[PDB]
Design a protein around this ligand. Structure first.
Ligand code: CLA
Ligand code: CLA
Ligand code: CLA
Ligand code: CLA
Ligand code: CLA
Ligand code: CLA
Ligand code: CLA
Ligand code: CLA
Ligand code: LHG
Ligand code: LMT
Ligand code: PQN
Lengths: 39, 333, 739, 77
């Protein structure tokens, strides 16, 4: 389980975790508030 | 088991059932498992054929072999094979399933709890030990088995006379049979027309005679040991008593294939189909007199052809085992 | 025969958190960014990871189970999307009016415009995989039936994942189990392909044929009987096919002509659907199963009868060929790379054969009139078979570098191939220059003659003719085949050879494909470009070990950049670099193959059908006058038919317009990696490393430019990603628009 | 359609003769006739094992299927 924590903390898994979380923010921001060309 | 001069023979796996022939405890466990498997087939395929039963279509042209057997006894049929109740077929087929489960348990009991030899046990389990050498113990086994076989013929007649009543082909109505036959001279005459019986009361009185002869035969084997002349002319070994029984069950299967194919009373045409004619190509097969839709044959044909081919190979199995008992090696040729 | 080792590798996550543990030079952790790239390139190089052949074979066996689990999850996803997010029940009612769709996009940022009107009120991505036509041929009626296949696909993937863990960590087979190739070929011909063909013939006879015969009759899909109802009640099966009343008795008694109502050699296509007759395909799969089970009894096993493949090969010697095939059995039971080179060559050849057979003999209902499905299925199976052919030249060269033992290769077929490499390659060099001059220079000649206003001096059917007379004769023999050389065939094997034009929805299913001067020239273009792709990859295999330039390339490896700038320059001498160059030439070969397919189908096959029987084609027969000239390929194919991919913006096909420009970008992006080189980029990175050292943000993992092989590998990956995504978007937007 | 006939002793006679012709072919040509599982009796089989008995009877059924359907197509049977 300790080595599974290391695999889940590797560079490909963490950048796939972050970019999913980042796309999770941007999709959910553009679903409730779409079409934001300016402020 | 005839192991000739070697007397300690490893039997491998393709002939692996010869290992327990001298082991009395494992001899019970195989045979009760056979009685479990036989009662399971009587239980499952009664309920299988209840589910695959159309009451509009006749039972003969459906591939059903167990429901016509109960219909001849008088269960589930009112007048003409329409089958209006079909609940006592379920109850009889259900009882054999639990009876297979009890016999399935006693097979696993004698495999594991009881030892491979019954001489290890003390009490009445020691007295049930048998070997293929002492003649008195094998007559004790033969005595009680003839008593229950005689009781089965009596409880057939007790069903046929008091509670229930069989089915007659002519004047199609379940009977009660209050006056069966009892004369020995009219029951001796069926050595020439056993297949062409048409009296329901004569079938009961024959079974009264058989159910009393086998009870008297079982009393005779339980009070008298096998005699000297029977010991001289018959080998008492393992696959020699099996050899007489394989030939005994082959002659019974040839008669049962003959009674199924042509008798109209014990196998009524409303349940099984029309009676057959004895044909002979390369083998004596029983053919249908009238044609049937598709390649499906009637229930009487499916019973008589199967039982003749089973009685042929159980006659060949008798010839195989009796040659093994007499001393033919089968590696000599 | 069955010999396994009990628990050779423990199951733990210790090596999960230690990447690069499989390689000795990567277990020390990173020092440069080359470590990250070498981690991925060496991950599946099991022969380089392990010296023991037994442990290499154990890694390969469990990797298949993991790969099969990927395929079942992909197969489960296709059946789940057909069950939950598809108009399959809508399409099954009206196949001629509802378009197949099985992908629904989420409505965000304007991408919900891709959910176009596919008919029946459904909105989604119009699929071109042909899954709907496959499922109608399988007898799929309800969406619950596709859901049950999708659940069982996930169950099979979990059993594939369990078998990979079991056969590596619990009971891993020994090397002698892997090297029993006679038992493996017996169980794969008879048990895998034979029983799979027998099972599918059993499925087609019982499920596919009764459902599709009622679907063609006009029964609504809600009123089709269920597949087990034919199994349970044979009255419905006997109503459709009266031979089922006779049962299995005509099968066992060799009275096989009873079954001729559902086991037909009918040929042609079903006029209701445009697909093959499922009576033909069930009889095809029955005959294939019997021959495959028979062929799976050929090889010697525990019971003495059979063939030893060593004794077959060592018997096949000759006067021209020395010791013959002696030692090829020891090659093909020791080297996994030699086996993979044969299997990739033939699976790649098979996938191309699948592409060329499914357009002209369409096996699925309503597939032939779906011009998008016909174009995509040809193109996808062309491209898949193209990569696998290049991988044959790859692992042929990996075997020659690594697993070629000259001690057991003396005067055999492989040794003698090596002993006349200059004879093979230079004659293959000659035939490529000959075919390039005599196919492409034919195109250059009449491009010039048409530009000079000399149409009489061209290579065309109006001018100097180059008729494909041998292919026209073979086409004529197949038209005359029913009744003369196939007397029990009622129709032809394919209408592409000649005869009837099949119409289904007022739309051409299959038409005679007439081969003229333009079909002569493009077939020699295909003969040219396949030969060059054969030339580069056979030069990679033969000269993997040595050449007159670098005589010790076997010590350098399979995958090395060069042997320096000396001897004039030994740039791209490795066996890997011929795979790198062969990937371009496979792309160049197969792009013309699918462009020949796309134009000849639309100009001369596909189109609408007049009620009197006339055919109005998609591009109105412009192949015979414009596919003889490069400009006609530019104008009447590339410029004309990509109007649908560039005017698709603001419509449901606009993602094809996006992906058309997306593949144009990555093709151009590849030329940064292909044309440049890493000594430029390493000197640029160390200037950027200075700006990171200025801000104290220089990483401990030192930034390096990609290696020379990698810069070729990235460049060939982006070229073939970009060039194929362009053609995929061009083909799919054009063929969805037409019809 | 090619002509096929129902089962008959004529059909059985050709099949047994095709089994016999492959048994004689298998006696002459099989290199390993007794390797692996043997017969219960080695005699009356030419020294064949279980693989050679099943191998020759399968070839005689393949030849049995090929000849019978070939002769029924030509109308000989
Ligand atoms: C240089 C980068 C660049 C810039 C400055 C933006 C900036 C923007 N894009 Mg954008 N976009 C880009 C690249 C860029 N994009 C590319 C590469 C794509 C293709 C994948 C898109 C496709 C795109 C879509 C489809 C949408 C945005 C949207 C937007 C807005 C984001 C509002 C938000 O989420 O808060 C904003 C105007 C959203 C918007 O509100 O549009 C005005 C919107 O719907 N973008
Ligand atoms: C009441 C029945 C009976 C009894 C108790 C015995 C007892 C014995 N027999 Mg057998 N024998 C009999 C009947 C009987 N047999 C019959 C009917 C045949 C003629 C075919 C023979 C012929 C025979 C031979 C050929 C041999 C024996 C052998 C044996 C011994 C080993 C058992 C064995 O091999 O099992 C193991 C069981 C199997 C490996 C299973 C085999 C399955 C068969 C081949 C398939 C049959 C399927 C059937 C056709 C389907 C029926 C369908 C249904 C609807 C009717 C055992 C002591 C052996 C012996 O004497 O040496 C010790 C020996 O080699 N017997
Ligand atoms: C039909 C064949 C049959 C025969 C010949 C035997 C024979 C015997 N049974 Mg029995 N038994 C059988 C079937 C049979 N059983 C089945 C069907 C079951 C019922 C599920 C069992 C379960 C059983 C039990 C539970 C016991 C016996 C025991 C005994 C022994 C008798 C001792 C005693 O007290 O007598 C009365 C003897 C070995 C006893 C014994 O000593 O076994 C070790 C004992 O414990 N039997
Ligand atoms: C695959 C195995 C198989 C199957 C499934 C059957 C099936 C059938 N057999 Mg059978 N048979 C077979 C093997 C098979 N047999 C073999 C190999 C033989 C030797 C050739 C026989 C010999 C045979 C005969 C002799 C007859 C049957 C018949 C029957 C039918 C009724 C059996 C019955 O009620 O007895 C049930 C058994 C009993 C009621 C007696 C045992 C129970 C006790 C002792 C009685 C009650 C005791 C209690 C205290 C009161 C049934 C459809 C009958 C039939 O109609 O034939 C067409 C018939 O008479 N069988
Ligand atoms: C009749 C028995 C049987 C069948 C069904 C197969 C089937 C399979 N074998 Mg196999 N094989 C067999 C016995 C059999 N083998 C024996 C006896 C040997 C030892 C000599 C081998 C040695 C063996 C190895 C060494 C490997 C295979 C592989 C495979 C797969 C072939 C490629 C693939 O993905 O197929 C398509 C997949 C399917 C059709 C799904 C089938 C689902 C289950 C398995 C049925 C396939 C699952 C290869 C593989 O991919 O490993 C998994 C692999 O390299 N087999
Ligand atoms: C592996 C494939 C396979 C499977 C498992 C089935 C399964 C079935 N077939 Mg069969 N069938 C198949 C291949 C197969 N078929 C092929 C390839 C043929 C052509 C020779 C047929 C032609 C066929 C006929 C003509 C019939 C069946 C029948 C049946 C049933 C007979 C069951 C039994 O033995 O009792 C069973 C459901 C019978 C049935 O009841 O189905 C309606 C029947 O009439 N089959
Ligand atoms: C526009 C594309 C282009 C052209 C024309 C060439 C040309 C050539 N390639 Mg190719 N190739 C290309 C792109 C191109 N390549 C790219 C993108 C790659 C990098 C991956 C490669 C990599 C490469 C490899 C890896 C291989 C080739 C080989 C060849 C030759 C093919 C056989 C041959 O001689 O055909 C005949 C020549 C032609 C078709 C060229 C056109 C000639 C015209 C029709 C005749 C002109 C007449 C002339 C001008 C009259 C003289 C008058 C005077 C005033 C000049 C040929 C010299 C192969 C080879 O050498 O095989 C033997 C081979 O090994 N190519
Ligand atoms: C008494 C011996 C005998 C006779 C006279 C026949 C006669 C026949 N065989 Mg036949 N056959 C036999 C034994 C015999 N067979 C044997 C022993 C085998 C078992 C291996 C076969 C297996 C066999 C197959 C596999 C087929 C025939 C077929 C044919 C028929 C057409 C053959 C033809 O024109 O070739 C065709 C000529 C060609 C040039 C085609 C070659 C193309 C291939 C793909 C290359 C013909 C009626 C065919 C049939 O059923 O026709 C309806 C067929 O498919 N035979
Ligand atoms: C016809 C041409 C043909 O392919 O002949 C094939 C010819 C067959 O040679 P052998 O009779 O030695 O072949 C025995 C085979 O079993 C291969 O071992 O081999 C060559 O001469 C190869 C050269 C082909 C180069 C052209
Ligand atoms: C005995 C040994 C024989 C060796 C055989 C070697 C191959 C010989 C090839 C013979 C070539 C036949 O010659 C060629 O025949 C075909 C079809 O028959 C004709 O082709 C004709 O039908 C085809 C369709 O099938 C049309 O596409 C074509 O436009 C038309 O002309 C050609 O006009 C003729 O040039
Ligand atoms: C641009 C270029 C470089 C520089 C390229 C480098 C250093 C690689 C840059 C990689 C970046 C950091 C990421 C690239 C994209 C990732 C592979 C995507 C990963 C997925 C993300 C979502 C995380 C070379 O090193 C080179 C070498 C030899 C010939 C040509 C060239 C060449 O053209």
């Amino acid at each position: 389980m300790d080595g599974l924590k290391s695999f889940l903390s590797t560079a490909p898994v963490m950048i796939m975790a972050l970019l999913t979380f980042t796309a999770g923010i941007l999709i959910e921001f553009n679903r409730f508030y779409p079409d934001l060309l300016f402020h | 088991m005839q192991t000739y001069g070697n007397d300690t023979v490893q039997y491998e796996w393709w002939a692996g059932n010869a290992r327990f022939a001298d082991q009395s405890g494992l001899f019970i466990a195989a045979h009760v498992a056979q009685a479990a498997l036989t009662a399971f087939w009587a239980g499952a395929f009664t309920l299988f054929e209840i589910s695959r039963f159309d009451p509009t279509q006749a039972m003969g042209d459906q591939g059903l072999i167990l429901l016509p057997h109960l219909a001849t006894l008088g269960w589930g049929v009112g007048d003409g094979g329409q089958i209006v109740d079909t609940y006592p077929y379920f109850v009889i087929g259900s009882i054999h399933l639990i009876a297979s489960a009890v016999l399935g348990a006693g097979a696993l009991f004698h495999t594991l709890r009881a030892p491979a030899d019954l001489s290890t046990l003390k009490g009445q389990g020691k007295k049930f030990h048998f070997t293929w050498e002492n003649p008195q113990q094998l007559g004790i086994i033969l005595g009680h088995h003839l008593l229950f076989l005689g009781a089965g013929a009596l409880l057939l007649a007790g069903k046929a006379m008091y509670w229930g009543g069989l089915y007659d082909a002519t004047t199609q109505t379940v009977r009660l049979v209050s006056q069966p036959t009892l004369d020995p001279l009219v029951i001796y005459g069926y050595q020439t027309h056993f297949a062409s019986i048409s009296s329901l009361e004569d079938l009961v009185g024959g079974h009264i005679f058989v159910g009393f002869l086998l009870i008297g035969g079982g009393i005779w084997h339980i009070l008298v040991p096998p005699l000297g002349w029977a010991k001289k002319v018959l080998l008492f070994s393992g696959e020699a008593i099996l050899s007489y029984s394989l030939g005994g069950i082959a002659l019974a299967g040839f008669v049962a294939a003959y009674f199924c194919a042509v008798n109209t009373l014990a196998y009524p045409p409303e349940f099984y189909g029309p009676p057959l004619a004895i044909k002979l190509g390369i083998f004596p097969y029983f053919a249908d007199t009238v044609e049937l839709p598709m390649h499906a044959h009637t229930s009487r044909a499916w019973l008589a052809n199967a039982h003749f081919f089973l009685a042929f190979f159980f006659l060949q199995g008798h010839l195989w085992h009796a040659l093994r008992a007499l001393g033919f090696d089968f590696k000599r040729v | 025969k069955v010999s396994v080792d009990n628990n050779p590798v423990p199951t733990s996550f210790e090596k999960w958190g230690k990447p690069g543990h499989f390689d000795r030079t990567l277990a020390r952790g990173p020092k440069t960014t080359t470590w990250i790239w070498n981690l991925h390139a060496n991950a599946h190089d099991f022969d380089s990871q392990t010296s023991d052949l037994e442990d290499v074979s154990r890694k390969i066996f469990s990797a298949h189970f993991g790969h099969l689990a990927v395929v079942f999850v992909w197969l489960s996803g296709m059946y789940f999307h057909g069950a939950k997010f598809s108009n399959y029940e809508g399409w099954l009612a009206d196949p001629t009016h509802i378009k197949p769709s099985a992908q629904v996009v989420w409505p965000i940022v304007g991408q919900g415009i891709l959910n176009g009107d596919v008919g029946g009120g459904f909105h989604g991505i119009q699929i071109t995989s042909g899954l709907f036509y496959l499922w109608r041929a399988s007898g799929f009626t309800d969406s619950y039936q596709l859901y049950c296949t999708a659940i069982g696909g996930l169950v099979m993937a979990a059993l594939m994942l369990f078998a990979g863990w079991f056969h590596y960590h619990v009971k891993a087979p020994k090397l002698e189990w892997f090297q029993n190739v006679e038992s493996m070929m017996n169980h794969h011909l008879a048990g895998l392909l034979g029983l799979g063909s027998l099972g599918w013939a059993g499925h087609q006879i019982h499920v596919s044929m009764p459902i599709n015969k009622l679907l063609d009759a006009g029964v609504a899909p809600k009123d089709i009987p269920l597949p087990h109802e034919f199994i349970l009640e044979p009255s419905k099966m006997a109503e459709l096919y009266p031979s089922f009343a006779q049962g299995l008795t005509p099968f066992f008694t060799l009275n096989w002509g009873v079954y001729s109502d559902f086991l037909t050699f009918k040929g042609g296509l079903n006029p209701v659907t445009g697909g093959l007759w499922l009576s033909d395909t069930a009889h095809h799969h029955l005959a294939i199963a019997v021959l495959f089970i028979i062929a799976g009894h050929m090889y010697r096993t525990n019971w003495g009868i059979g063939h030893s493949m060593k004794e077959i090969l060592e018997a096949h010697k000759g006067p021209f060929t020395g010791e013959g095939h002696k030692g090829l059995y020891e090659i093909l039971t020791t080297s996994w790379h030699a086996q993979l080179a044969i299997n990739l060559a033939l699976l790649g050849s098979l996938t191309i054969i699948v592409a060329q057979h499914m357009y002209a003999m369409p096996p699925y209902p309503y597939q032939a009139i779906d011009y998008a499905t016909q174009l995509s299925l040809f193109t996808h199976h062309m491209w898949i078979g193209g990569f696998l052919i290049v991988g044959a030249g790859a692992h042929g060269a990996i075997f020659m570098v690594r697993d070629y033992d000259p001690a057991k290769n003396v005067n055999n077929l492989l040794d003698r191939m090596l002993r006349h490499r200059d004879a093979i390659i230079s004659h293959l060099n000659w035939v490529c220059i000959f075919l390039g001059f005599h196919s492409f220079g034919l195109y250059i000649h009449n491009d010039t003659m048409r530009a000079l206003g000399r149409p009489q001096d061209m290579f065309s059917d109006t001018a100097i003719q180059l008729q494909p007379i041998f292919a026209q004769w073979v086409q004529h023999l197949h038209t005359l085949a029913p009744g003369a050389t196939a007397p029990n065939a009622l129709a032809t094997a394919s209408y592409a050879f000649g005869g009837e034009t099949i119409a289904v929805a007022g739309k051409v299913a299959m038409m005679p494909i007439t081969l003229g001067t333009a079909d002569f020239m493009v077939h020699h273009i295909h003969a040219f470009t396949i030969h060059v792709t054969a030339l580069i990859l056979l030069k990679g295999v033969l000269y993997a070990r040595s050449s007159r330039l670098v005589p010790d390339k076997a010590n350098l490896g399979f995958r090395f950049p060069c042997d320096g700038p000396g001897r004039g320059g030994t740039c791209q001498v490795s066996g890997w670099d011929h795979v790198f160059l062969g990937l371009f030439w496979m792309y160049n070969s197969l792009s013309i193959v699918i462009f020949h397919f796309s134009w000849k189908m639309q100009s001369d096959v596909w189109g609408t059908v007049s009620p009197d029987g006339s055919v109005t084609h998609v591009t109105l027969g412009n192949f015979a006058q414009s596919a003889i000239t490069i400009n006609g390929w530019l104008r009447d194919f590339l410029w004309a038919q990509a109007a649908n991919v560039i005017n698709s913006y603001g419509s449901a096909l606009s993602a094809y317009g996006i992906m058309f420009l997306a593949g144009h970008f990555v093709f151009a992006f590849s030329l940064m990696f292909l044309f440049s080189g890493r000594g430029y980029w390493q000197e640029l990175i160390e200037s950027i490393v200075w700006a990171h050292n200025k801000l104290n943000v220089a990483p401990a993992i030192q930034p390096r430019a990609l290696s020379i092989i990698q810069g070729r590998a990235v460049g060939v990956a982006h070229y073939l990603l970009g060039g194929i995504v362009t053609t995929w978007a061009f083909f799919l937007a054009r063929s969805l628009s037409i019809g | 359609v090619p002509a096929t006939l129902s089962w008959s002793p004529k059909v059985a006679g050709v099949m047994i003769a095709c089994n016999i012709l492959a048994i004689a072919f298998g006696k002459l040509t099989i290199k390993q006739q007794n390797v692996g599982t043997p017969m219960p009796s080695s005699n009356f089989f030419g020294g064949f094992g279980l693989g050679a008995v099943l191998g020759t009877a399968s070839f005689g059924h393949i030849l049995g299927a090929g000849v019978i359907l070939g002769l029924a197509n030509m109308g000989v049977l």
